[PDB]
Amino acid sequence: TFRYRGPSPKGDQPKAIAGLVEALRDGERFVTLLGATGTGKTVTMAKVIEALGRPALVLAPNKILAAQLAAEFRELFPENAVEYFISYYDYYQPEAYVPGKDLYIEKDASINPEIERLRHSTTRSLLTRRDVIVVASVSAIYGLGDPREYRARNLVVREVLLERLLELGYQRNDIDLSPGRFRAKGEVLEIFPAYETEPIRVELGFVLFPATHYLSPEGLEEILKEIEKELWERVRYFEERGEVLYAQRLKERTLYDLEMLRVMGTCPGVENYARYFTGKAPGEPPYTLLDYFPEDFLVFLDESHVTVPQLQGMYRGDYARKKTLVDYGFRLPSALDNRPLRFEEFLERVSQVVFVSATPGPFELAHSGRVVEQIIRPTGLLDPLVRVKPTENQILDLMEGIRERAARGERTLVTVLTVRMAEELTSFLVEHGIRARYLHHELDAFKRQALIRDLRLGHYDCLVGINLLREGLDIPEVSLVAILDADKEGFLRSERSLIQTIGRAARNARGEVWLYADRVSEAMQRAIEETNRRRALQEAYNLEHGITPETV
Ligand SMILES: CCCCCCCCO[C@@H]1O[C@H](CO)[C@@H](O)[C@H](O)[C@H]1O
Ligand SMILES: CCCCCCCCO[C@@H]1O[C@H](CO)[C@@H](O)[C@H](O)[C@H]1O
Ligand SMILES: CCCCCCCCO[C@@H]1O[C@H](CO)[C@@H](O)[C@H](O)[C@H]1O
Numbered sequence: 001t002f003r004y005r006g007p008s009p010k011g012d013q014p015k016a017i018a019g020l021v022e023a024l025r026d027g028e029r030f031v032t033l034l035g036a037t038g039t040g041k042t043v044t045m046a047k048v049i050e051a052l053g054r055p056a057l058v059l060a061p062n063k064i065l066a067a068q069l070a071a072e073f074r075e076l077f078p079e080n081a082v083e084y085f086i087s088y089y090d091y092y093q094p095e096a097y098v099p100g101k102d103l104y105i106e107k108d109a110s111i112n113p114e115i116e117r118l119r120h121s122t123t124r125s126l127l128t129r130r131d132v133i134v135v136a137s138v139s140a141i142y143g144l145g146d147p148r149e150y151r152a153r154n155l156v157v158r159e160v161l162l163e164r165l166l167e168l169g170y171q172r173n174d175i176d177l178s179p180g181r182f183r184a185k186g187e188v189l190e191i192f193p194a195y196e197t198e199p200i201r202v203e204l205g206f207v208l209f210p211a212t213h214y215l216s217p218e219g220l221e222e223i224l225k226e227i228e229k230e231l232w233e234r235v236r237y238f239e240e241r242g243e244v245l246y247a248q249r250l251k252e253r254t255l256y257d258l259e260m261l262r263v264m265g266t267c268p269g270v271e272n273y274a275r276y277f278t279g280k281a282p283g284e285p286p287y288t289l290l291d292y293f294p295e296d297f298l299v300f301l302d303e304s305h306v307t308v309p310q311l312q313g314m315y316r317g318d319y320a321r322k323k324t325l326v327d328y329g330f331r332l333p334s335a336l337d338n339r340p341l342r343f344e345e346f347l348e349r350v351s352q353v354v355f356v357s358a359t360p361g362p363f364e365l366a367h368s369g370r371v372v373e374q375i376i377r378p379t380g381l382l383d384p385l386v387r388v389k390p391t392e393n394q395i396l397d398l399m400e401g402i403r404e405r406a407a408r409g410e411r412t413l414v415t416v417l418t419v420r421m422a423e424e425l426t427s428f429l430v431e432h433g434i435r436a437r438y439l440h441h442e443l444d445a446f447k448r449q450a451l452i453r454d455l456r457l458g459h460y461d462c463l464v465g466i467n468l469l470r471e472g473l474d475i476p477e478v479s480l481v482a483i484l485d486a487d488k489e490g491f492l493r494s495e496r497s498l499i500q501t502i503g504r505a506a507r508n509a510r511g512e513v514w515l516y517a518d519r520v521s522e523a524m525q526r527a528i529e530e531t532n533r534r535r536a537l538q539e540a541y542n543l544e545h546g547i548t549p550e551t552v
Pocket of ligand 2: 458
């Protein structure tokens with residue numbers, strides 16, 4: 001049972017909630033929430049979750065949005081369990097090998113304790129409460145230990161109770177303490193649970209869950225035997241090919257791990273032997289976070305037009321990177337079984353799915369048994385006016401438009417199609433009195449968000465880039481979005497992409513989008529019509545309720 005404490009639903013949220021709830025209660029497996037930018041999709045998801053009272057998983061297209069959603073849900077359900085199943089492949093380097101330059105890359109060690117802490121807090125809550133909402137990036141869905149063992153291996157709250165501490169994955173280190181380590185300096189225990197930020201001093205209640213998701217198994221001895229059996233078979237494979245270097249590499253690394261496991265029941269990169277620990281057969285789908293949820297959990301795929309394709313391509317992407325480590329003797333073929341799920345395998349592990357997007361993709365449109373939209377924004381803000389302007393004298397027209405807006409405190413976003421164009425336009429604008437910066441495609445997150453942050457803070461007035469479908473670009477001061485080569489083919493000029501880009505001007509009471517082109521492509525035509533449809537519906541709602549837009 002959840003306890004919603006956020007703002008009451010306004011605009012189209014009430015209608016969206018209900019209908020969405022009605023569809024789910026009627027047993028629809030696939031449902032889509034078609035919600036324009038700024039209509040408050042998080043609150044809608046939250047009320048649906050509250051109404052159904054089932055634990056939920058919300059997947060986002062990237063780590064920035066994932067973190068953002070987690071933070072919002074925590075504020076909306078201050079008394080329930082909101083988890084962020086962050087993944088190590090989000091901020092750190094995984095093991096890898098690039099044939100191109102024969103360079104092998106080790107995964108980062110001694111990572112920030114917050115990573116594993118958040119992950120353990122997630123599995124712990126899922127096995128102790130129903131009022132749980134888990135947010136995660138799609139990439140987070142990867143092989144994980146067997147949930148049965150993780151579950152059946154707990155410690156309820158003497159002296160034998162320090163034989164348990166270890167068969168749960170906890171390690172000794174009286175020196176410095178770490179989450180998932182114990183300190184026994186005499187008659188006094190100090191367990192630091194893998195999911196806590198505050199250790200537990202024991203002298204003279206709670207429930208301790210394992211410190212690892214791949215904790216030791218049944219015939220540990222017998223398991224190391226099966227792994228070594230695969231090792232020599234694979235060594236022979238290389239030997240017969242004359243690839244002595246690969247045979248040597250695989251032998252040394254595998255024997256090192258086997259020895260490590262025989263002396264600590266664990267070893268760095270233990271996940272690679274996942275299948276041996278879960279007893280899964282080769283090729284079979286591994287256990288994942290999904291298996292830790294109750295059978296009736298609800299799934300939300302935020303930005304579904306992006307997240308669905310991500311879920312569809314995860315397996316292939318991972319296979320390519322892993323297959324390389326296998327081909328050159330760094331890992332056993334069995335490491336391939338510690339992988340992401342194929343899309344169909346994912347669908348086999350979920351019951352009901354709610355797709356969320358302002359521009360739902362083909363999968364959601366062909367499969368949803370119900371599409372519920374929310375167009376009216378709680379704020380009453382209108383979708384922008386969209387104009388089509390000639391390419392003749394585009395830059396001069398744009399420049400005067402930008403300077404006019406900067407004069408009165410308004411910002412401009414500009415999208416071009418090539419790097420040369422982005423480079424030249426930016427320098428040209430700067431040389432003509434405009435505070436413009438270039439959002440280079442090589443910029444990573446936070447750095448990309450740092451630049452965007454400066455625009456939000458008003459350090460400059462115009463941001464030029466190729467792909468503007470980035471996070472954090474919904475700024476109230478942006479009143480103009482200019483799209484050069486608006487009629488050219490390509491992903492960034494598709495119907496959906498145009499609609500998404502147009503939305504960057506919907507947080508300003510005077511928002512406008514200028515499409516520079518000498519012809520109207522079908523994508524433009526459709527995007528213009530949809531923006532007009534939304535604007536008209538919201539103007540009608542505002543008229544009826546006596547609301548007049550204002551920027552804020
Ligand atoms: C468990 C380890 C088994 C090692 C057995 C290696 C057998 C070598 O294998 C041989 O290598 C030659 C290389 O010139 C090839 O030409 C032969 O075809 C191949 O059978
Ligand atoms: C055409 C002449 C227009 C004059 C209006 C100028 C409005 C200035 O604009 C304001 O300046 C403040 C201080 O820099 C900022 O903090 C505000 O965010 C910004 O809107
Ligand atoms: C460029 C995209 C054009 C899309 C066509 C939108 C048509 C909306 O319909 C409009 O409704 C108005 C009611 O206020 C009427 O006054 C207009 O005559 C009518 O065209």
